[PDB]
């Protein structure tokens, strides 16, 4: 009866254990790739910066040449730190809304795991914008104590629901509700609202 | 009068920057540049410069391996590294390197270490010692 | 044989499973790094740009900016130096010091003599062995009631072999495989092994590949 659950747990732990080693193996790799990229590049920046400063008056033309390399190696090195990964922007919006809701003393109810990993980068960016606005509305208007965000891959759509337990305050052009609907509809998506038990927004976009 | 320096560094951009930084000193002169440990062994045994600035990780022969081959020549070897790897410090000492510094140490401190080493001193970065 | 194609499918699956855990990691590091280093790197670019645009108009300011650039770089290199060392894990030489302290604090005589120390072991396999060495000794301290603990660490052929023996009494059941199974699973993942002898106290033999 409960030995099912006992063994099931034992399996998940032994699985989570192997994960840590894989993590640590990739971590070991990343560190080696950093010391070979970042290290050499940061060391080079310092030296060329030193040299550039030492040639300001002696040979400003060379100092300028060196300062161009310094600005270039810096831009690439930052670009190389971004090149550890390919991507998800909706995961960054998730962090923003957690901070905003906590700062507003509104309990945030969500699940990091369910987040859809496949959606076009455009549709992902549209959803990020709409998720931000739905939560801005919760903070500004609802007087909610709780906000629930659901993100689900349902058939050929990504569906995001933002619900709160406050009270709807509305009875328009240039504002968020119509703005989100128009942007979503242009993307062959939709926005629906339920204002009975607080406010619940259901936003869908093709995927 | 003038300190003769050989620089062994596999990364060309850094090799060039180091040579440029050291040629700015009035009492110093870069007499040769190399990209491998062998380039260092060959130049030092043949041309006998006062000082050899040696990178560790280079293809073919490392700067530590090059330093070992040059242990009984009269050349003063200064190692340069970015990261302190374990045992590089003990291998450096045992090879008789006169200096072990960081590549990114301010240029004023590298020229100072070259002068100190020429004055019979041993200059080791505290960061590179395997005790903080 | 079909057994080859099934093992192809088993490697493909195991690698697909792995590839998602590695992406978890990449995404963690790649944000923690763009966070802590990202600003500093952009500041370097901007101040380099500005210092080049000033060189002739106001060289005194160029110099001031360049001094900043110089230091911003120097500080980020120190940041990376720490990030890099942390990511690399627990060194076996450091674990050896920890177990000497632990055994002495427990009034258990520690017997160790350096012989055939591994010339080169991967940082991963080194970290796995550190973890196993720690656990073997935690078990001695918690359970054995030993007065002596012998640790041997040797490179033998294409393996690093660690033996931890104690002169106490084994307290486990017929099948005691928690740490014992944890160490075995961790070692076996690395194509290593764990063997145990519980006759005259407890002796653990752990091996991991190394060339
Ligand atoms: N979660 C929520 N709880 C309570 N009232 C809400 C709500 N979301 C929206 N409303 C109501 O609907 C109105 C219209 O919302 P909308 O987002 O279009 O404009 P707005 O007042 O937020 C200005 P903008 O969106 O341009 O910043 C709000 O002013 C408010 O009365
Ligand atoms: N050196 C040793 N001397 C005596 N008994 C030992 C021993 N090492 C292990 N054992 C016995 O084997 C059992 C299983 O060891 P194991 O390391 O797997 O679990 P544990 O009891 O140490 C909890 P954990 O390892 O999760 O901290 C112990 O509880 C003990 O009875
Ligand atoms: K000169
Ligand atoms: K010598
Ligand atoms: Mg709004
Ligand atoms: Mg090198
Ligand atoms: Mg245990």
Numbering used by the authors:
A (entry chain B): 154 to 239, 243 to 327, 332 to 367
B (entry chain C): 0 to 131
C (entry chain A): 155 to 331, 335 to 368
Paper quotes:
The simplest TCSs comprise a sensory histidine kinase (HK) and a response regulator (RR) component. To address this question we have used the TCS DesK-DesR from B. subtilis as a model. We had previously shown that the HK DesK, a member of the HisKA_3 family, undergoes important conformational changes to switch between phosphatase- and phosphotransfer-competent states. We now report the crystal structures of the DesKC:DesR complex, trapped in the phosphatase and the phosphotransferase functional states.
One using the phosphatase-constitutive mutant DesKCSTAB, and the other with DesKCH188E carrying a phosphomimetic substitution, both in complex with the REC domain of DesR. (D) Cartoon representation of the DesKCH188E:DesR-REC (phosphotransferase) complex, along two orthogonal views (left and right subpanels). Note best fitting with a one dimer DesKCH188E (chains AB) to one monomer DesR-REC (chain C) model. The structures show the RR REC domain adopting identical conformations in both phosphatase and phosphotransferase complexes, presenting active- and inactive–like features in different regions of the protein, arranging the RR’s active site for phosphoryl group migration. Except for the phosphate lid, the REC domain bound to the HK largely resembles the RR’s active form, shifting the position of the β1α1 loop and helix α1, now able to recruit the Mg2+ cation essential for phosphoryl-transfer catalysis. The β4α4 loop in DesR plays a key role in these controls, remodeling its configuration in concert with DesK-association. This loop, acting as a phosphate lid, is open in the phosphotransferase complex, enabling the transfer reaction. Taking into account that phosphotransfer is a nucleophilic substitution at phosphorus, the reaction coordinate distance (i.e. between phosphorus and the entering atom, before the transfer reaction has begun) strongly suggests that P~DesK→DesR phosphotransfer occurs through a largely dissociative, or ‘loose’ mechanism: a reaction coordinate distance of ≥4.9 Å provides room for a fully dissociated metaphosphate intermediate. Our model predicts an important role of the highly conserved Thr80(RR) in stabilizing an intermediary metaphosphate group, ideally positioned to accompany the migrating phosphoryl moiety. Yet, the phosphate lid is expected to close in, following the phosphoryl migration during transfer, due to the strong phosphoryl-Thr80(RR) interaction. Phosphotransfer thus results in a fully activated RR configuration, with a closed phosphate lid that ensures the release of a stable P~DesR species, as observed in active free RR structures.
